């Protein structure tokens, strides 16, 4: 039997790269999406052309709310329904935008989105993944710049720190069940679609190794290592994939 | 004129000790509390008997909800209402209980409480504190020295304390241009839980390299007083461990 | 043209397992050793039987002294002399013994040995590696327990801390030359030969992931990853390979 | 009776400020120096003028060598000879200069100087301090240790080893009641020769006030750690950096 993976936010960019690589490695994949239905299905179409019935899609909002646990549980269930098993969870989906401390979503909607997508949904999915249970692991997409954060990104930063705490707490607690829990921390990978090109080059120029961003594939490579048999003793570890960026003083 | 401080969860234990020491240092204090009304009033009474009109209490639930921001705004506004200023914010109030990943409150209530008290309310109180300014302004967040060696089955609590580390850093960076410093104090083992039995308390005490005992509430409060003082005017974004070496001890 | 790697302290245990996996991956190897002459030459024989002329030994004391730079330069030179190139350096050789602060070598010898092997030698080998110069990289064998250190191991812990600093500084400074510098940090792996059984078992019981020590091969797997094409954007990272041990409170 | 402190590299700048504040707090002080004899002596004369018989000087090279353990024992012993006790050790003296990985001092002299001053000497002074016993040690660290100066490998290795010492010694000496902590400046007093335009570059990076820490601000954090108000604090390194270490590239 082929193992199975859930990748959240898998329609585009890094999540897509991660789904594609797991599938190339032999996984069957659940492609979760929120708004990008068309892109999710076109990826599944591409993956299912390669190997029939090895990719499904799954829709969910991962904003925190009264129904988030049920949604998270259904994401995990959808993998069991499609493939009869769930070997790997990749927590990739993530809201990202500024939340200034001093001055139209309300602040509490921003808390729900930023803290839900980056921390609470990962926790709930982690609970469901472990409950519903080999080489089992979870990989959380973290952020190499958590200790030198973007200015005015308090909530996003809080959510990523919380995700580090989850990675550690879950590694500790799930080790007796054979479930490893690790992270991959990009620095500058694919820049935001909205960022202007000048500003993109400014960030690229900061990176010591090659003065460029990481491709989505290079991030996906670290995920693939972490879920592999070459990482069977690794839990609680967060691998930076940042080209030295986090080492560069102001 | 005397400066003023808000201390969250200040009715008892470490919060009380911080309020008392701020008061002994010359601050007027807002003693925030949630359920411990009697202890909070008893504190304010003692402080006002020492110096009249220098302590008031302020009730608020710091669970996350759509009204938590107005509740946090009101906490800061109660300092200005009582004392005409707000110089210091200490984020001490904290929910703390296990949330096992594999198996009472709904999980969304646990999230609301553990993440709300430990991170969201500090963030909203920071926003409000900063917004109301309009000097030695600072914020001290009560953190946790065992954050990278966490208590088994305390996921949400640990997430909340990690998030608070991130707020401390993010706010230190962002509020520095306003002259608001933001720091943290990280206890290891201090006052053990009221409900813990003596035998269990001793097991923890025996782990502590420095004196095989927990930190007094006062010793925690001392590090808070340092960070608010003029002796710490260049310190921002620092979290001081107050743990007798506990976090250095391997399994 | 097959790449070439120097592995220090490669006669035995983790260093051995690293040299073996590097060789299996296609590398030619310099098997550095200090006192383990017989195991070193025996390992070279093993590997050379598999592919002729793909392993040589190189003897050197890595204690700090006025001649250590020359010795380090020679180790690198020995890789060029055997194979015409040097693509990978693995800093594995390491002295390890207690140096109590309060009361049969002298303290300056203990300093030279512990700080030399764990920090100075890696620094000088890094200099000579870079000076002599693609997928070039350096992997430093660190320690996951560096912030929860063994009692009365000050000098050793100082050495491994210094080694983290080197990893970071070297990643930063060598990134313009295309040389990546990373680390692998074991917790409990192969236990001391001189340690007694009951004590070995006490340490095993502490490891959340499986209640056992890492094999030398599990440690080598992480080295192999960091030198590979799948780690091309990775520099300045230290991967814990510790089964969750560093997450466990006292 | 008055407690006593050894401050290494105390003739100038941050070490001087530390020695003065310790003295203002009631400590008798050993002012260690290497080359700056004239400044160490004028400091001693200043402090003895304030209160008689409360400052002495001690010359020593803290470069690593065969004789460094004896030199470090002598510094401690000199505190006992002058004052009958040694309550506080402040490891401040520090060599600092670039050591590029790719290219008069040989590289082994740089190793001896950079690693000796920043790490080995603190280690030897710590053993001597402890062997002779509110006792504490404060080590001067560096807030920028994880975002290091380009081409300062050996220096950075030295300061990292110092963090390790701080932690290892905190753990091991806790049973004797000796606390061991650090103060980590980011940008404090800039090099004497540095052009203002270069100094200002650094000052502008500092979120809190867009200026460097005074030596006195660094000293304040030392005074807190040695005090009765830090009685439970061991193995802690306090950044005194105006938020510099939180600033991304
Ligand atoms: N890009 C970088 O340079 C970088 C740097 C540091 C860290 N990271 C981390 O690496 C991961 C991938 O980054 P990325 O740049 O590829 O991410 P991204 O494009 O910002 O977002 C990934 C996906 O997250 C999903 N998402 C957003 N809000 C959601 C919600 N409320 N509910 C459910 N799904 C939601 C979206 O799915 P739909 O499109 O289907 O709505 C989106 O496509 C993230 O965790 C990120 O924080 C990335
Ligand atoms: N004690 C330790 O050894 C230790 C260890 C590590 C970290 N710390 C940190 O140091 C701080 C103080 O510790 P502690 O042991 O003194 O704390 P605590 O006794 O557990 O709780 C402090 C106060 O938190 C308030 N609180 C709890 N839930 C709340 C809610 N939903 N809304 C508003 N307030 C709420 C309570 O106020 P009421 O009583 O009025 O309801 C309580 O009195 C905490 O942040 C803690 O995490 C302590
Ligand atoms: N084993 C673990 O659990 C563990 C835990 C954490 C970190 N690590 C790190 O992983 C690496 C490998 O660990 P290990 O247990 O396999 O190492 P080890 O057996 O203790 O030492 C490996 C080799 O280092 C060489 N060595 C010692 N002193 C030397 C000197 N003065 N000059 C040159 N070489 C010298 C020895 O070579 P000869 O035998 O040829 O004399 C020895 O065989 C080390 O860096 C270690 O610190 C290991
Ligand atoms: N200035 C900063 O911004 C900054 C930033 C980060 C960390 N720090 C740390 O804070 C501490 C004080 O900094 P600073 O700028 O005031 O230091 P500094 O002026 O660079 O050096 C202080 C003293 O160290 C002594 N020293 C140098 N080499 C020595 C040797 N071989 N043996 C004995 N003593 C030696 C010198 O004593 P003599 O003059 O008597 O020869 C010198 O005056 C240092 O530990 C430093 O690394 C400072
Ligand atoms: C220059 C730049 C811009 C964004 C990001 C990024 C970090 N975390 C992120 N998380 C998400 N969900 N999207 C992102 N685009 C980022 C990193 C560097
Ligand atoms: C042995 C022991 C027991 C509890 C605590 C504790 C950590 N964080 C905490 N946070 C709160 N709000 N209360 C607590 N009691 C703790 C630490 C060590
Ligand atoms: C129970 C135990 C005993 C030793 C080691 C070990 C740490 N670092 C080490 N470094 C070297 N060069 N050899 C080792 N054997 C170790 C780890 C756990
Ligand atoms: C712009 C600048 C220049 C030097 C220093 C400094 C760091 N560590 C140091 N250590 C010593 N012994 N001296 C120093 N002068 C420094 C910090 C910022």
Short mmCIF file of C-alpha atoms in Angstrom, two decimals, chain A residues 37-220:
data_model
loop_
_atom_site.label_atom_id
_atom_site.label_comp_id
_atom_site.label_asym_id
_atom_site.label_seq_id
_atom_site.Cartn_x
_atom_site.Cartn_y
_atom_site.Cartn_z
CA UNK A 37 -10.75 25.54 -5.77
CA UNK A 38 -9.78 25.77 -9.43
CA UNK A 39 -6.04 25.50 -8.74
CA UNK A 40 -6.58 22.63 -6.25
CA UNK A 41 -8.53 20.58 -8.79
CA UNK A 42 -6.05 21.27 -11.65
CA UNK A 43 -3.25 19.97 -9.38
CA UNK A 44 -5.28 16.90 -8.51
CA UNK A 45 -6.07 16.41 -12.22
CA UNK A 46 -2.28 16.56 -12.93
CA UNK A 47 -1.41 14.15 -10.16
CA UNK A 48 -4.24 11.71 -11.00
CA UNK A 49 -3.11 11.68 -14.68
CA UNK A 50 0.20 10.29 -13.39
CA UNK A 51 -1.35 7.69 -11.05
CA UNK A 52 -5.11 7.22 -10.97
CA UNK A 53 -7.00 7.86 -7.73
CA UNK A 54 -3.94 9.12 -5.80
CA UNK A 55 -5.05 12.78 -5.27
CA UNK A 56 -8.23 14.26 -3.74
CA UNK A 57 -9.18 17.78 -2.73
CA UNK A 58 -10.66 18.97 0.54
CA UNK A 59 -12.17 22.41 1.25
CA UNK A 60 -12.00 24.19 4.60
CA UNK A 61 -11.60 27.57 6.24
CA UNK A 62 -8.91 27.26 8.94
CA UNK A 63 -9.81 30.57 10.68
CA UNK A 64 -10.50 29.83 14.35
CA UNK A 65 -14.22 29.55 15.15
CA UNK A 66 -16.72 27.35 16.93
CA UNK A 67 -16.67 24.91 13.97
CA UNK A 68 -12.88 24.74 13.38
CA UNK A 69 -12.45 21.49 15.30
CA UNK A 70 -15.11 19.75 13.27
CA UNK A 71 -13.53 21.07 10.06
CA UNK A 72 -10.07 19.84 11.11
CA UNK A 73 -11.46 16.48 12.03
CA UNK A 74 -13.10 16.23 8.61
CA UNK A 75 -9.81 17.05 6.83
CA UNK A 76 -8.20 14.11 8.56
CA UNK A 77 -11.28 11.92 7.87
CA UNK A 78 -11.22 12.81 4.21
CA UNK A 79 -7.73 11.22 3.97
CA UNK A 80 -9.00 8.07 5.70
CA UNK A 81 -12.07 7.99 3.42
CA UNK A 82 -10.06 8.41 0.23
CA UNK A 83 -7.04 6.28 1.01
CA UNK A 84 -7.76 4.21 4.16
CA UNK A 85 -4.89 5.67 6.14
CA UNK A 86 -3.08 8.94 7.04
CA UNK A 87 0.66 8.81 7.41
CA UNK A 88 1.71 12.44 7.10
CA UNK A 89 0.29 15.85 7.96
CA UNK A 90 1.87 18.96 6.57
CA UNK A 91 0.62 22.18 8.24
CA UNK A 92 1.32 24.74 5.55
CA UNK A 93 -1.79 26.94 5.16
CA UNK A 94 -1.20 30.39 6.63
CA UNK A 95 -2.67 33.86 6.70
CA UNK A 96 -0.08 36.63 6.57
CA UNK A 97 -0.62 40.34 6.84
CA UNK A 98 0.23 43.33 9.07
CA UNK A 99 -1.57 44.02 12.40
CA UNK A 100 -0.14 47.27 13.75
CA UNK A 101 -0.22 47.83 17.49
CA UNK A 102 -0.97 51.55 17.12
CA UNK A 103 -3.47 53.33 14.83
CA UNK A 104 -11.53 46.56 7.53
CA UNK A 105 -11.41 43.26 9.43
CA UNK A 106 -11.91 43.72 13.16
CA UNK A 107 -8.94 42.95 15.40
CA UNK A 108 -10.66 39.77 16.62
CA UNK A 109 -11.20 38.51 13.04
CA UNK A 110 -7.45 39.10 12.50
CA UNK A 111 -6.77 37.05 15.70
CA UNK A 112 -9.05 34.32 14.33
CA UNK A 113 -7.37 34.18 10.93
CA UNK A 114 -3.73 34.70 11.93
CA UNK A 115 -3.73 32.69 15.10
CA UNK A 116 -6.17 30.08 13.70
CA UNK A 117 -4.34 29.27 10.48
CA UNK A 118 -0.81 29.36 11.93
CA UNK A 119 -1.43 27.69 15.30
CA UNK A 120 -4.91 26.58 16.29
CA UNK A 121 -5.78 24.65 13.12
CA UNK A 122 -2.37 22.93 13.29
CA UNK A 123 -3.10 21.92 16.91
CA UNK A 124 -6.61 20.60 16.03
CA UNK A 125 -5.38 18.74 12.98
CA UNK A 126 -2.59 17.32 15.12
CA UNK A 127 -5.17 16.12 17.63
CA UNK A 128 -7.35 14.53 14.93
CA UNK A 129 -4.35 12.95 13.15
CA UNK A 130 -3.10 11.30 16.30
CA UNK A 131 -6.56 10.28 17.52
CA UNK A 132 -7.45 8.48 14.27
CA UNK A 133 -4.42 6.25 14.45
CA UNK A 134 4.86 2.55 9.88
CA UNK A 135 6.44 6.02 9.56
CA UNK A 136 4.02 8.63 10.86
CA UNK A 137 5.00 12.25 11.08
CA UNK A 138 3.77 15.79 11.05
CA UNK A 139 5.68 18.70 9.47
CA UNK A 140 4.86 22.26 10.39
CA UNK A 141 5.78 25.18 8.17
CA UNK A 142 7.40 27.65 10.48
CA UNK A 143 9.42 30.86 9.79
CA UNK A 144 13.17 31.38 10.04
CA UNK A 145 12.62 35.05 10.95
CA UNK A 146 10.56 34.47 14.09
CA UNK A 147 13.20 36.15 16.26
CA UNK A 148 13.75 39.12 13.94
CA UNK A 149 10.19 39.62 12.83
CA UNK A 150 8.58 41.85 10.25
CA UNK A 151 7.65 45.23 11.70
CA UNK A 152 3.90 45.52 12.60
CA UNK A 153 3.29 41.74 12.23
CA UNK A 154 2.58 41.00 15.95
CA UNK A 155 -0.27 38.54 15.49
CA UNK A 156 1.36 36.66 12.57
CA UNK A 157 4.54 36.42 14.69
CA UNK A 158 2.56 35.25 17.74
CA UNK A 159 0.95 32.54 15.57
CA UNK A 160 4.32 31.31 14.29
CA UNK A 161 5.82 31.26 17.76
CA UNK A 162 2.79 29.32 18.93
CA UNK A 163 3.45 26.89 16.08
CA UNK A 164 7.03 26.36 17.36
CA UNK A 165 5.54 25.61 20.85
CA UNK A 166 3.11 23.12 19.23
CA UNK A 167 5.88 21.42 17.32
CA UNK A 168 7.79 20.86 20.56
CA UNK A 169 4.85 19.96 22.75
CA UNK A 170 3.43 17.56 20.16
CA UNK A 171 6.85 15.92 19.50
CA UNK A 172 7.19 15.24 23.19
CA UNK A 173 3.65 13.90 23.72
CA UNK A 174 3.23 11.90 20.52
CA UNK A 175 6.69 10.21 20.60
CA UNK A 176 5.24 7.22 22.47
CA UNK A 177 2.84 6.62 19.55
CA UNK A 178 5.67 6.67 17.02
CA UNK A 179 4.48 9.96 15.50
CA UNK A 180 7.35 12.39 14.82
CA UNK A 181 6.70 16.15 14.78
CA UNK A 182 9.08 18.51 13.07
CA UNK A 183 9.26 21.87 11.32
CA UNK A 184 10.67 23.54 8.20
CA UNK A 185 11.42 27.27 8.57
CA UNK A 186 11.82 29.22 5.35
CA UNK A 187 13.29 32.69 5.30
CA UNK A 188 12.67 34.34 1.98
CA UNK A 189 11.05 31.83 -0.35
CA UNK A 190 8.40 32.81 -2.93
CA UNK A 191 7.69 36.47 -2.40
CA UNK A 192 4.12 37.74 -2.01
CA UNK A 193 2.30 38.17 -5.30
CA UNK A 194 1.41 41.68 -4.19
CA UNK A 195 4.98 42.78 -3.38
CA UNK A 196 6.45 45.19 -5.90
CA UNK A 197 9.48 43.95 -7.86
CA UNK A 198 11.92 46.55 -6.46
CA UNK A 199 11.04 45.49 -2.93
CA UNK A 200 11.43 41.80 -3.97
CA UNK A 201 15.01 42.45 -5.12
CA UNK A 202 15.71 44.26 -1.91
CA UNK A 203 14.90 41.07 0.07
CA UNK A 204 16.74 38.81 -2.39
CA UNK A 205 19.92 40.90 -1.95
CA UNK A 206 19.93 40.21 1.82
CA UNK A 207 20.39 36.45 1.34
CA UNK A 208 24.03 35.36 1.75
CA UNK A 209 23.73 32.12 -0.18
CA UNK A 210 23.11 33.20 -3.82
CA UNK A 211 21.35 36.51 -3.10
CA UNK A 212 18.03 34.92 -4.12
CA UNK A 213 14.93 33.37 -2.57
CA UNK A 214 14.44 29.69 -2.00
CA UNK A 215 12.30 28.02 -4.62
CA UNK A 216 9.18 26.21 -3.39
CA UNK A 217 10.93 22.97 -4.35
CA UNK A 218 13.86 23.65 -2.00
CA UNK A 219 11.41 24.13 0.90
CA UNK A 220 9.59 20.92 -0.22
#
